[PDB]
Structure 1
Amino acid sequence: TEQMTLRGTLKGHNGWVTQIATTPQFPDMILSASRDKTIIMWKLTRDETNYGIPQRALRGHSHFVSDVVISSDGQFALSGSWDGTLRLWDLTTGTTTRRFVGHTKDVLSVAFSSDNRQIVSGSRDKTIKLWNTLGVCKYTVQDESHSEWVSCVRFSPNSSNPIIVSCGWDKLVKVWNLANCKLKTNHIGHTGYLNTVTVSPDGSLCASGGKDGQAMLWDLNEGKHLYTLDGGDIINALCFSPNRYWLCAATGPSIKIWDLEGKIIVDELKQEVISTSSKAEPPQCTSLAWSADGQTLFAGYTDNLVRVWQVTI
């Protein structure tokens, strides 16, 4: 039966792992961000003595790098940072193409479109904003926006239509359609602020979570509240699987991998159980991302490590 083994663990950070992402073009790369103010591009050897080595280290920020995302070609990479700026990397030696100037506060969330021509940003400005790849502002959203910090935005894969998700700490999830830039809907739910949201690879769903730590499911186009599940104390990051209908929820002491059909927990990932006391005996898990193979998944922790796992039958 499909179950999990502890694969290995990476090392090479002085700051807490904030995000991880992986391009399906090169699954032999993997990319990471951290509060050591650098994004590290790795070189994955599949030896079990290690599991990878840092290849290069991209440098140049004056505050944390919150979120990071790959290009659809894997030849570019983009970052959002708490210095209020973004950078557009050339992941071959270094040498930033462009830095995006204009925010008054942190840039928390960021995402990179499928056509590689639209780039969004969530900010503690309380503004979602759109960005040309030339590094200028196609649009700015300041009407019908969140009344609190913007937690996470997403581009939605679709048949062709433009839809983007937005969720803030005002305990609401707003869906936006481009070329009118209007509220498609407002979804109400979750007591306490929202941390994260993520969209299905098919794109008709929004799995949302927050302080509540409950996983509520919404319909993108039907606009209906499907159901709610108790996901534990707090869920900081979510990521669907590419080759299954699972959903992997990142809670503090454990990662909870959920089968969706039927609705049940498959397993709970436990890491090293080393004796420590008392407020967070293991480090909290904060980010996670699947590989495109779907065999292996990765995790971000606050001990500066990325723990690897692998599915075993």
Structure 2
Amino acid sequence: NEVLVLRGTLEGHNGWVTSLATSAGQPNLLLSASRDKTLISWKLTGDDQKFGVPVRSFKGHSHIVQDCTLTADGAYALSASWDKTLRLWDVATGETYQRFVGHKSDVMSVDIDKKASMIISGSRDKTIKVWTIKGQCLATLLGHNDWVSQVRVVPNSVTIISAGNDKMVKAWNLNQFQIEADFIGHNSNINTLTASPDGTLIASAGKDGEIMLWNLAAKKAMYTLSAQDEVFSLAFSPNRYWLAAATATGIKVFSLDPQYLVDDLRPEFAGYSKAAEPHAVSLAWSADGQTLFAGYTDNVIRVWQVMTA
């Protein structure tokens, strides 16, 4: 008796909302990144026709901000930018504490370990970099033969996973700075990947809309879910066996146990033309899993909540 219901919007960005992040420490805080070169922290009220408001603007990047995340406590933000750098921000003030310089091209992805002791990034320079929180590059991981689109830390000795336009998904052992597993099977550019909260599964997808699920430990492919259209973002529910996928035609929410389509979220748009309908390119679940945030190509964040029918 549970459905996803459109609750409201968060307006304030002036470019595609490319990335979203929530935090367990601050369940009322949302972080967003945009092609408008900025990030925005939001205060969530969840009230009427204004689910929340912008509290801070994070300005400093000279190009598109592609990815962002918050530390566990929500005190700090990380951003990856096409300007070839990452920045660590003080969420309270909106200031940049540290710059991360080293990539030779667009930085497409950023993530951080649970201890918030080291930072990982992916770039169109084909490399993955490991940094200290003080902005010092420690090492560069080589193996991808094309752009790296996304890098993520696997929840659990740190293990990360990456995907790129070489159709490869890779797991790396940071204790060795070496490849742990090659996941072959994608036939198209991979836009996004993510690890299940228990760190046992990998989900990855891109252009052809094929969402491949991998058994990390066994280093094997399990099955593929057809989303039909290009997938831009994937996000496992923190508390449900649900996998949300932002696609060119809507947000498909898959139940994995048992297997069925929870929903295909498709908002009604203005009167845009069909040809020009905006779509979601970013996703984030709230810590409690009762809220799903999605950033769109019309600069708007849309908010769904799990309610009783």
> Considering the TM-score relative to the shorter chain, is it more than 0.5?
yes
Relative distance call for 1:278 and 1:46 in structure 2 (3 A) is closer
Corresponding residue for 1:155? 153
Work out whether residues 24 and 73 of structure 2, in 8 Å CA contact, stay in contact via their aligned partners in 1.
no
Work out the percentage of aligned pairs sharing the same amino acid. Answer: 55
| Structure number with higher strand proportion | 2
Specify whether residues 306 and 172 from structure 1 end up closer, same or farther in structure 2 by C-alpha distance, changes over 3 A only: same
Unaligned runs of 5+ in 1: none
CA shift digits 1:102-147 (9 cap, x unpaired): 22111100101101111011011111110011211211123xx111
Q: Is the 8 A contact 2:20 2:282 kept in 1?
A: yes
Question: In the aligned structure 2, how far is the partner of 1:15 from the partner of 1:273?
Answer: 17
Aligned length: 308
Q: TM-score, normalised by structure 1?
A: 0.95
Q: What's the counterpart of residue 141 of structure 2?
A: 141
1:241 to 233, 237, 243: 237
Q: Is the contact made by 2:284 and 2:294 (CA closer than 8 Å) also made in structure 1?
A: yes
**Offset from partner CA, 1:186-216 (integer Å, 9 cap, x none):** 1111211100100000001100101121111
- The letter for the 1-side match of 2:302 is R
* Equivalent-residue separation in structure 2 for 1:140 and 1:252 (angstroms): 33
Among 187, 193, 196, the alignment partner of 2:189 is 193
Aligned counterparts of 2:70 and 2:37: Cα–Cα separation in 1: 17
In structure 2, give the amino acid aligned to 1:303: D
Give 1:273 shift.
Answer: 4.4
What's the CA shift string for 1:223-277, capped at 9, x where partnerless? 1211112111111100000111110111122211111111110122121244332
Task: State the secondary structure of the residue aligned to 1:279.
Answer: helix
Aligned: 1:121 with 2:117: no
Q: Secondary structure at the match of 1:52?
A: strand
Residue 109 of structure 1: aligned partner: 109
Secondary structure in 2 matching 1:45: strand
> 4+ runs of 1 displaced by more than 4 Å?
none
Cα shift at 1:99? 0.8
CA distance in 1, matches of 2:211, 2:184: 13
Q: Which residue of 2 aligns with 1:223?
A: 219
Tell me how far apart the structure 1 counterparts of residues 178 and 50 of structure 2 sit (CA, whole Å). Answer: 49
TM-score, structure 2 normalization: 0.97
Q: Distance in 2 between matches of 1:181 and 1:100?
A: 19
The corresponding residue for 1:289 is: 284
Distance 1:276 1:87 in 2: 36
User: Do the aligned partners of 2:269 and 2:278 also contact (CA within 8 Å) in 1?
Assistant: no
Which one of 294, 297, 306 corresponds to residue 299 of structure 1?
294
What does residue 203 of structure 2 align with? 207
The structural deviation recorded for 1:309 is: 0.9
Separation in structure 1 between the aligned mates of residue 110 and residue 94 of structure 2, nearest angstrom:
20
1:10-67 Cα distance to aligned partner (Å, 9 max, x none):
1111111000110111111111010111101112222113111111111111101110
Aligned residue type for 1:302: T
Distance 1:130 1:44 in 2: 32
* Conservation of the 8 A alpha-carbon contact between 2:26 and 2:73: no
Q: CA deviation at 1:292?
A: 1.2
Following superposition, the deviation at residue 5 of structure 1 comes to 1.6
Mapped to 2, the partners of 1:119 and 1:136 lie a distance apart of 10
Aligned: 1:32 with 2:40: no
Q: How does 1:51-66 map to 2 (within 5 A)?
A: 51-66=51-66
